[PDB]
């Protein structure tokens, strides 16, 4: 009976996804606990198409976050629009997306829903990558109170510190209509490395207001904090002598977000939803480095404010059904960097009295549009849109004196295809413009080649979902082309330079429930993940031709659940093949072992857990391993100050404890 969906990102329901005409996959806060995940990068790469690299670089600690889709640069996710219930996560989504602090905790969430293609018209920018929104906890119905906790240990390494992560939910909706939980996350402890000491508060209070079926309101109030020493690379001598050890004393990295946000849904009948969301973020990110012969201190300072009105419209129009969606957005970012400094040869850390080499104020202003049409006829449903940017940044030098500016627009226009098979079975193909900014840091370089234009990419994909109950199933494939970037994939980075891409591969995974083969398989569950990835260098210069660095060409998981009774055994494998570290693809190690090929791996994981039901507060107790065999391996990180080798995760224990009001 005609209903309007709008909104088809929300709370990623099941059928939003199976419905998806584009490669999307969501992982439910159900199945966090299975492989002892308490961080996001342990969820997102059981996602096939993302590669969320362990801590290196500038992002060597957990308050920032690493990952990209498809071959797409992981360092500090800056490819793929990152959002937390929609909004913005990016303390400069436009100017500079790298986060490399990211405000956001898995314990604070229902699910990820990874987007990476179909989502070019209703979200941006940096959408080459798709789009990854965390879907915060949901207002309990009837109050409610949720506790968890884990604790992990890496025995064969000398860091002897455990880390633990814990989450409290407490909420719920009075009879008035008016609800609010709070969702708190908090993160203390080091990981297998030495220094690496962390703390991380994630406090937020979520409320929901609906007097009536007709107006609902929603607000998010959050609260980040954090610090954490950074570990840092090592040499090759270094890391042979011992890998768990940190050379970069210095290192160490902070930050807070305050964060406020209002929406207003205003929906007459089932026919149509006019939409309306506000919010305002404050940002400040720091840290010490060890730079050559000096040390630094970086205090940044970010203020974001956007407001987005939407909304979405359905009528017959013959036996067409046509679901029209429009939406507005006016973004603005406002930024302050700085850089103090002192010689590591005296024996002082930097501060506010040291002298300082930088000091820049950057800032964007972006209005973007989108119109969508969702037509279904017969078992089709295909829906063309159109998504238009213009935005203008700028920056600021206060040393210098130089004031530089940019405007341009990024036109993206798409289509998108979804056919239905049968009740179970759909299949879908599309096309969709992408674009990445221009950052601030690339402003200098944009004015002086006399080239102000976005990066532009174009995606095609094809691919089909099953789900008949015992079998669920996907698999599909993907072309991005990828030009204009301002970051050359040459050795060398010159003025006019401009890096183009190619990510071309395959995407698939499945489940399937032994059990319908022999009751003796029964609550006998396997499944597995995998993509086959090949991003590639296109652009004319000395690399060309040489394969885009840190990006495995296969990466996936297997494994098997069986759950008799009230008891829970997981089994689970994490695989990927080898990657390089620079653009010139050098297989041979350097010293200093920040180059050089980096190998593939395959680990083992298990766990038991058992839960204790209704009386003594649904108890789940549980143990479990990571990287059984310990099996020995390391990533890299190329480019920044603390670049070197990072060793693997090695054998870890932990424990998971849960309970439920």
Same mark, same amino acid.
């Given at each position: 009976a005609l209903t309007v969906v709008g909104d088809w990102l929300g709370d990623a329901r099941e059928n939003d996804v199976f419905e998806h005409a584009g490669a999307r996959d969501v992982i439910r806060r159900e199945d966090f606990a299975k492989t002892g995940a308490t961080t996001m990068r342990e969820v997102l790469n059981?996602?096939?198409?993302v590669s969320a690299p362990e801590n290196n670089g500038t992002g060597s600690h957990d308050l920032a976050m690493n990952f990209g889709i498809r071959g797409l640069n992981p360092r500090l996710a800056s490819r793929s629009t990152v959002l937390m219930d929609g909004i913005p996560?990016?303390?400069?989504?436009?100017? $500079?997306?790298?986060?490399?602090?990211?405000?956001?905790?898995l314990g604070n969430m229902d699910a990820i829903d990874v987007?990476?293609?179909?989502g070019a018209v209703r979200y941006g920018p940096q959408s080459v990558g798709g789009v990854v929104n965390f879907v915060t906890r949901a207002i309990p119905q009837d109050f409610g109170i949720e506790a968890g906790v884990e604790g992990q240990l890496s025995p064969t390494s000398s860091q002897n510190n455990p880390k633990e992560t814990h989450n409290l939910m407490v909420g719920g909706t009075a009879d008035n209509g008016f609800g609010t939980a709070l969702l708190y996350s908090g993160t203390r402890g080091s990981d297998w490395r030495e220094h690496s000491a962390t703390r991380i508060d994630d406090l937020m209070l979520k409320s929901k207001y609906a007097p009536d079926e007709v107006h609902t309101f929603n607000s998010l109030l959050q609260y980040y904090d954090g610090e954490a020493d950074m570990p840092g690379g090592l040499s090759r001598a270094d890391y042979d002598a011992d890998?768990? $050890?940190?050379?970069?004393?210095?290192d160490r990295f902070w930050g807070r977000r305050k964060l406020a946000s209002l929406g207003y849904q205003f929906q007459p009948d089932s026919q149509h939803k006019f939409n309306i969301q506000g919010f305002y973020t404050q940002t400040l990110r720091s840290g010490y480095l060890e730079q050559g012969k000096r040390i630094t201190l970086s205090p940044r300072n970010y203020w974001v404010r956007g407001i987005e009105p939407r909304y979405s419209q359905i009528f017959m129009i013959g036996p067409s059904a046509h679901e029209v969606g429009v939406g507005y957005r006016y973004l603005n970012e406002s930024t302050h960097e700085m850089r103090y400094y002192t010689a590591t040869s005296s024996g002082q850390l930097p501060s506010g009295s040291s002298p300082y080499d930088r000091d820049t104020r950057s800032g964007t202003e972006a209005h973007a549009w989108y119109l969508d049409d969702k037509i279904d006829i017969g078992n089709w449903t295909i829906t063309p849109g159109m998504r238009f940017e213009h935005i203008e940044s700028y920056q600021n030098n206060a040393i210098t004196g130089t004031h530089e500016e940019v405007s341009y627009n990024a036109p993206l226009p798409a289509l998108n295809v979804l056919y239905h098979l049968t009740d179970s079975w759909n299949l879908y193909a599309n096309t969709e413009g992408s674009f990445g900014t221009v950052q601030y840091s690339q402003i200098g370089k944009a004015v002086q080649s006399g080239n102000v234009e976005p990066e532009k990419a174009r995606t095609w994909e094809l691919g089909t979902r099953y789900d008949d109950g015992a079998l669920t199933a996907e698999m599909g494939l993907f072309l991005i082309n990828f030009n204009?970037?301002?970051?050359?994939?040459?050795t060398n980075d010159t003025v006019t330079a401009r890096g183009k891409t190619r990510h071309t591969g395959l995407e698939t995974q499945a489940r399937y429930d032994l059990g319908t083969l022999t009751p003796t398989l029964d609550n006998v569950s396997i499944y597995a993940s995998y993509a086959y990835v090949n991003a590639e260098i296109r652009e004319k210069g000395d690399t060309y031709g040489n394969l885009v660095p840190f990006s495995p060409k296969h990466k996936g998981t297997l494994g098997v659940d069986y759950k008799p009774g009230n008891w829970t055994f997981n089994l689970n494998s994490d695989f990927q093949s080898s990657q390089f570290a620079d653009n010139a693809n050098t297989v041979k190690e350097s010293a200093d072992g920040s180059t050089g090929r980096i190998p593939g791996f395959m680990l083992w994981g298990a766990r038991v857990a058992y839960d204790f039901g209704?009386?003594?507060?649904?108890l789940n107790l549980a143990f479990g391993v990571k990287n059984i065999f310990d099996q020995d391996y390391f990533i890299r990180s190329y480019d920044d100050n603390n670049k070197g080798i990072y060793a693997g995760q090695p054998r870890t224990l932990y424990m998971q404890g849960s309970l439920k009001f």
């Open positions: 059981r996602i096939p198409g996560v990016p303390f400069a989504p436009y100017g $500079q997306p790298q986060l490399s602090l990211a405000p956001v905790s987007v990476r293609g179909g890998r768990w $050890q940190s050379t970069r004393p210095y204009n970037q301002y970051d050359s994939n040459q209704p009386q003594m507060a649904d």
